[PDB]
Amino acid sequence: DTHPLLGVGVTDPTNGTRVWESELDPDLLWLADFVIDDLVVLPGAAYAEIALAAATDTFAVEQDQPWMISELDLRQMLHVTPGTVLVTTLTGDEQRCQVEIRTRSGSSGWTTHATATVARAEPLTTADLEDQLDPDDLYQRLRGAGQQHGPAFQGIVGLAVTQAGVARAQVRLPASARTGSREFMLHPVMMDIALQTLGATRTATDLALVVPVRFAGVHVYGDITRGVRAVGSLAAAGDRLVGEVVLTDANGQPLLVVDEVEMAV
Amino acid sequence: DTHPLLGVGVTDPTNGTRVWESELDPDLLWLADFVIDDLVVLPGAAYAEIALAAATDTFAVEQDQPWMISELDLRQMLHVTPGTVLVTTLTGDEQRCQVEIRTRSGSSGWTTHATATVARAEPLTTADLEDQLDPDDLYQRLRGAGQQHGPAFQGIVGLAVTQAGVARAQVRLPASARTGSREFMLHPVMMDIALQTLGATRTATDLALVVPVRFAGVHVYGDITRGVRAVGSLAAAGDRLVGEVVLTDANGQPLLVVDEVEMAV
Ligand SMILES: C/C=C\C(=O)SCCNC(=O)CCNC(=O)[C@@H](O)C(C)(C)COP(=O)(O)OP(=O)(O)OC[C@H]1O[C@@H](n2cnc3c(N)ncnc32)[C@H](O)[C@@H]1OP(=O)(O)O
Numbered sequence: 001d002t003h004p005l006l007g008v009g010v011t012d013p014t015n016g017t018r019v020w021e022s023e024l025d026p027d028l029l030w031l032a033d034f035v036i037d038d039l040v041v042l043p044g045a046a047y048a049e050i051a052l053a054a055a056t057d058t059f060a061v062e063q064d065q066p067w068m069i070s071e072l073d074l075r076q077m078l079h080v081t082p083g084t085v086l087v088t089t090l091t092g093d094e095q096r097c098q099v100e101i102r103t104r105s106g107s108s109g110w111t112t113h114a115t116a117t118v119a120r121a122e123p124l125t126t127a128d129l130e131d132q133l134d135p136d137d138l139y140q141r142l143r144g145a146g147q148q149h150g151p152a153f154q155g156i157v158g159l160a161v162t163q164a165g166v167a168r169a170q171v172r173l174p175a176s177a178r179t180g181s182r183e184f185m186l187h188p189v190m191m192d193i194a195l196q197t198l199g200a201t202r203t204a205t206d207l208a209l210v211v212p213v214r215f216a217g218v219h220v221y222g223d224i225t226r227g228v229r230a231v232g233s234l235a236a237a238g239d240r241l242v243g244e245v246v247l248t249d250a251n252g253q254p255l256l257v258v259d260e261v262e263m264a265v
Numbered sequence: 266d267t268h269p270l271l272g273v274g275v276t277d278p279t280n281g282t283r284v285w286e287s288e289l290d291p292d293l294l295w296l297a298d299f300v301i302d303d304l305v306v307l308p309g310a311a312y313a314e315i316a317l318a319a320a321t322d323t324f325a326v327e328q329d330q331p332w333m334i335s336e337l338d339l340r341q342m343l344h345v346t347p348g349t350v351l352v353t354t355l356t357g358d359e360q361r362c363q364v365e366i367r368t369r370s371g372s373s374g375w376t377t378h379a380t381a382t383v384a385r386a387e388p389l390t391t392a393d394l395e396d397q398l399d400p401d402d403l404y405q406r407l408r409g410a411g412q413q414h415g416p417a418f419q420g421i422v423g424l425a426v427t428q429a430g431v432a433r434a435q436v437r438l439p440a441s442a443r444t445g446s447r448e449f450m451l452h453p454v455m456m457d458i459a460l461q462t463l464g465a466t467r468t469a470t471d472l473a474l475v476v477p478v479r480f481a482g483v484h485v486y487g488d489i490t491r492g493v494r495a496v497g498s499l500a501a502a503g504d505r506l507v508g509e510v511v512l513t514d515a516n517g518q519p520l521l522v523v524d525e526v527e528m529a530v
């Protein structure tokens with residue numbers, strides 16, 4: 001009945017802050033599947049998940065998706081070592097607040113990995129010739145570079161890129177990531193699975209590893225597990241690879257809208 | 266392995282504070298035995314206990330009694346209602362800090378009951394004719410006024426007052442309060458049991474209910490369960506009934522030193 005990533009938390013009466021602590025491990029669920037150069041890093045998507053549940057455990061809301069993510073900076077990666085404790089802090093109001101996700105050293109030393117801003121949620125054909133692409137080349141490309149994705153993250157079963165740069169991918173939630181997923185507000189693997197569609201976009205498909213540093217405008221409208229198609233596009237600005245993905249269900253309705261996915265090497 | 270009164274706690278990284286939360290109940294151990302006018306109030310002694318364990322769970326010390334209590338204000342009593350949550354906050358350093366003990370309303374409203382100051386611990390015959398007194402008159406007196414003590418708090422098995430005002434009492438730890446006592450740093454019933462020796466002092470024994478508001482200089486040197494004698498004395502200053510008790514073991518060595526026990530109606 002407890003969120004395996006946020007952990008239980010209490011409120012600090014001296015100020016207005018609220019803290020959360022959670023035990024992390026490479027054995028926790030699908031964490032082992034994300035790997036950057038043989039290390040169990042934490043996927044960027046996860047932070048967004050934790051940032052939302054914090055506002056949910058703090059405020060009373062009678063909606064299935066009352067929160068949207070405004071800004072999401074990611075300062076340093078998190079090596080998931082055994083016995084790692086994850087510390088989260090919330091501060092603000094129900095219209096808008098702030099969330100910091102840090103890692104604890106001993107008991108009085110911490111290292112922040114992601115600062116966030118959360119607010120209330122908002123309301124909901126010419127020459128794009130697709131060249132059918134093999135996913136096991138991307139995965140291989142991605143893995144080759146140094147991003148050995150795990151089975152639970154191999155959700156792209158089919159994908160192609162248009163003659164303009166936009167990438168279209170048929171995604172699904174593999175069963176290994178389906179274990180213990182009702183506790184989430186926004187699955188962290190899907191959101192990554194939606195993000196890795198940027199590996200097929202034109203600007204990406206000529207650099208022969210890219211990591212997402214900052215997000216902006218992450219909108220959730222429905223349970224994102226019911227998603228089968230993601231449309232990925234990105235541009236560049238020197239070192240500013242800005243992106244934009246959208247995850248939609250069978251009937252074309254939107255589920256996940258990510259306005260800006262600024263990336264870097 | 267967890268303190269039943271302090272509860273588990275986590276550290277707030279936004280500031281330097283550390284919070285603790287604990288479930289309280291009238292069914293918890295000997296809590297039901299303390300009663301003020303048919304209500305399960307929390308005994309003053311308990312706060313001192315919680316204030317010490319907070320500094321112990323916060324700082325590394327290789328001593329059996331490294332902390333002493335400097336000041337202990339008690340603002341409002343705590344009606345122990347079922348499902349009551351107790352909130353404790355620590356702030357300061359290992360040489361000297363501050364502790365607040367409050368009660369939580371819902372999740373974001375609190376009421377402080379006792380502020381405290383804690384610091385490092387310090388190093389360790391003429392006309393006093395005693396008139397042997399019956400404890401079951403004091404208890405009756407005390408109960409009569411409106412302080413129906415419980416069995417676990419009936420530790421005074423023999424007491425007398427000298428021809429000057431000082432009260433001497435042979436105290437013991439009843440078995441009903443002996444259940445689950447290794448978890449404490451300073452038993453809260455004993456300290457009360459040492460305090461109720463002030464009910465035999467001269468200034469007290471002519472008012473025919475007194476409550477302790479503020480303490481000062483509470484020194485602990487040993488496990489206070491091994492105590493068999495308490496020497497109680499107090500004076501008055503209008504509404505300022507200042508006291509002083511000391512709990513000693515069999516071989517006369519001191520165990521509990523309370524410099525000031527300012528009381529009021
Ligand atoms: C996908 C793989 C893993 C994941 O899923 S996690 C995804 C997100 N998390 C990450 O792994 C990225 C974490 N960090 C990085 O990789 C990124 O840092 C990075 C390693 C790229 C880039 O290194 P920097 O630390 O320099 O980048 P910053 O995050 O500090 O911000 C960019 C820029 O702004 C400046 N900046 C930003 N914030 C601050 C502050 N606070 N103070 C001073 N200066 C600042 C800083 O000088 C930086 O200079 P350059 O990056 O060299 O251009």
Ligand SMILES: C/C=C\C(=O)SCCNC(=O)CCNC(=O)[C@@H](O)C(C)(C)COP(=O)(O)OP(=O)(O)OC[C@H]1O[C@@H](n2cnc3c(N)ncnc32)[C@H](O)[C@@H]1OP(=O)(O)O
Pocket residue numbers: 301306307308309310339340341342343475476477478529530
């Ligand atoms: C033994 C029975 C139960 C126990 O074991 S618990 C033992 C300790 N706990 C208690 O039950 C006592 C709790 N409270 C009381 O009983 C005590 O209040 C009391 C009910 C007596 C006395 O009432 P007060 O609230 O007035 O007393 P204070 O604690 O506020 O302090 C004394 C005095 O200083 C002033 N004061 C002190 N702190 C403040 C602040 N912060 N702001 C403004 N003014 C303040 C205040 O005006 C007070 O005026 P009087 O008491 O009327 O003389």
